Design an enzyme around this catalytic site. Structure first.
Site: not given
Length: 284
Positions: A16, A18, A144, A148-149, A162
């Protein structure tokens, strides 16, 4: 204590994503819950030490809005961490797929194609805030926080989580301040950028930016600016502009998160409350 899983119950389907420290796979897990089941597996590449610590950490972090950890497989190699599968991937990608810039129409049977409704954008925000309330309660500092997380699952359930490789998948969102550590500057307050101070107040500032991402369908903050320009903006006290989708009462919640004095920032708890409230009764 840590749950362990037998390698034979884990069957990888395909990769999915890397990073320099691991790969993530989609896969099936047998005999995990009373059966045959889809999950996400982080496969890892001194190392086995931090792994053990991390495995213990995220067994302690259980909550309705934290991505669910099922356990590890440390029997042989590589070291595997097993998580619930979140079918819509990270919140940033989910947002962009429902944005106006979205080329292809978004698919799936659990959410409508195209722009989300105010109620939905609000519940997204409320769910992330909820997870941040939890963490704060444990004096845990994320450091963070960004869409996106976070992750989005079946039925638009949103959870914080994440796989430790955002600096690779999303490198555009990190910059070596002073030529040192890669930091997510666009999501950071001045004290963190300037002095590397990361706190609960640092996190609430980041949540403010997450709200903005949410109401811009995942546009990068300060997307027209270079990294040095963004640092200048943030340092001088320039604030992101209210998004077109965004009603004043929501923008006021963002600005609350962006108080220059850390102690002046509204608590995550209050932000959550004002967000749930509004989600239940979305303004016009």
């Amino acid at each position: 204590c840590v749950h362990h899983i037998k390698r034979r119950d884990i069957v990888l389907k395909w990769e999915l994503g890397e990073g320099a420290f691991g790969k993530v796979f989609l896969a099936e897990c047998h005999n995990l819950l009373p059966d045959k089941m889809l999950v996400a597996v982080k496969a890892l590449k001194s190392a086995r030490q931090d792994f053990q610590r991390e495995a213990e950490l995220l067994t302690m972090l259980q909550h309705q809005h934290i991505v669910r950890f099922f356990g590890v497989c440390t029997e042989g190699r590589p070291l595997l961490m097993v998580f619930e599968y979140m079918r819509h991937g990270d919140l940033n990608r989910f947002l962009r797929s429902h944005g106006p810039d979205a080329k292809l129409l978004a698919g799936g049977e659990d959410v409508a194609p195209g722009p989300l409704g105010l109620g939905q954008l609000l519940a997204v925000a409320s769910q992330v805030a909820a997870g941040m309330v939890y963490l704060a309660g444990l004096h845990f500092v994320h450091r963070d926080l960004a869409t996106r997380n976070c992750l989005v699952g079946q039925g638009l359930v949103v959870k914080i989580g994440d796989f430790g490789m955002s600096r690779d998948i999303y490198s555009t969102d990190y910059y070596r301040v002073g030529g040192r550590t890669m930091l997510p500057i666009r999501w950071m307050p001045p004290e963190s950028i300037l002095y590397r101070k990361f706190t609960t107040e640092s996190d609430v500032w980041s949540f403010g930016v997450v709200l903005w991402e949410i109401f811009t369908y995942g546009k990068q903050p300060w997307y027209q600016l270079s990294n040095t320009e963004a640092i200048d903006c943030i340092t001088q006290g320039r604030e992101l502009e209210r998004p077109r989708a965004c009603p004043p009462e929501v923008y006021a919640i963002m600005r609350g998160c962006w108080q220059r004095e850390p102690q002046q920032r509204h608590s995550i708890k209050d932000v959550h409350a004002r967000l749930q409230a509004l989600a239940q009764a979305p303004p016009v």
